[PDB]
Every structure is written in structure tokens, then in C-alpha cells.
Design a protein around this ligand. Sequence first.
Ligand SMILES: [Zn+2]
Length: 46
Amino acid sequence: GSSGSSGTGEKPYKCNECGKVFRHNSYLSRHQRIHTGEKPSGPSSG
Ligand SMILES: [Zn+2]
């Protein structure tokens, strides 16, 4: 799971939820999606 307070990769774009690394942000943002998604707790955006 989340084993590592701070991770350093060879790419400027790396996921924190899983840890995987990507080349472009687009792929990162779209990917992170698989993580996000849950009941609304606090008002962030609307
Ligand atoms: Zn991820």
C-alpha cells in the first residue's frame, strides 16, 4: 500500500495513491480517477 512518506522517480509525474509513474500529466490525472470517487464529505468544488 502506502509505504513511503516521500517517493522519488525518474519522471515529474508520479501517482501517490498507488505509486505508479507516468510521462505526461494527462495520463496521470485520468489515471488517478481509478482512485478518486466516494461519498461527498466536504465542499471542495461545485
Ligand atoms: Zn494511481
